[PDB]
Amino acid sequence: KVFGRCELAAAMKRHGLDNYRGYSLGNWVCAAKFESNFNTQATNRNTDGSTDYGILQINSRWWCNDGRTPGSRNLCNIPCSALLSSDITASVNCAKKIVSDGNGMNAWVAWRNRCKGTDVQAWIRGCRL
Ligand SMILES: O=C(O)c1cc(O)ccc1O
Ligand SMILES: O=C(O)c1cc(O)ccc1O
C-alpha cells in the first residue's frame, strides 16, 4: 500500500507514535517519506547482505527474519514479510522497540540525514488528526 502523507500520519497516530519516546508525529512521517516513499512494500538490499523492509525500512540483520541474513537476531520476533503489509501494526510495534533501544531515531539513516534538524512539523501540516 502506498499511503498518502496525511493518511499515514493518522495511521501512525492511532498506533501510538505521536510523541513516542519524545518524537513528534512529523518525525515519523518524515522518516517514512525518505525511507520508503510511504510504500509498505518497499524492500532494499544492504551491502552486508541484509535487507530493509516496509515503510520504515526495518533491517533483517537485527529486527526481523527473512531466512537469508546470516547472523540475524530477529529481535521483533516477526517474519520480515510482516513489515510489508497494508496494516502497519507490525512495522509500528517493531519501530517502537528500535527507537527505545538507546539511539532513538538515529537508527534510521534517512531520518538522521533528511529529517533531524529540519521543520519536521511540516510533514503533518494540513492533516486532520
Ligand atoms: O490506523 C490505521 O491502521 C490506518 C490504516 C489505513 O489504511 C488508513 C488510515 C489509518 O489510520
Ligand atoms: O524526493 C524528494 O526529495 C521530496 C522532497 C520533498 O520535500 C517532498 C517530496 C519529495 O518527493
UniProtKB/Swiss-Prot annotation:
**Superkingdom of the source species:** Eukaryota
Is the keyword Electron transport in the record?
A: no
Enzyme active site = 35, 52
Give the SMART domains listed for this entry: LYZ1 (SM00263)
| Span of domain C-type lysozyme | 1-129
Catalysed reaction per UniProt? Hydrolysis of (1->4)-beta-linkages between N-acetylmuramic acid and N-acetyl-D-glucosamine residues in a peptidoglycan and between N-acetyl-D-glucosamine residues in chitodextrins
Indicate the transmembrane segments per the record: none
Ligase in keyword set = no
Q: What are the subcellular locations of this protein?
A: Secreted
What job does the chain carry out?
Answer: Lysozymes have primarily a bacteriolytic function; those in tissues and body fluids are associated with the monocyte-macrophage system and enhance the activity of immunoagents. Has bacteriolytic activity against M.luteus.
Q: Which family does it belong to?
A: Belongs to the glycosyl hydrolase 22 family.
| Self-association and partners | Monomer.
Q: What's the protein here called?
A: Lysozyme C
Q: Which organism is it from?
A: Gallus gallus
The taxonomic lineage of its organism, from the top, reads: Eukaryota, Metazoa, Chordata, Craniata, Vertebrata
- Gene symbol here is LYZ
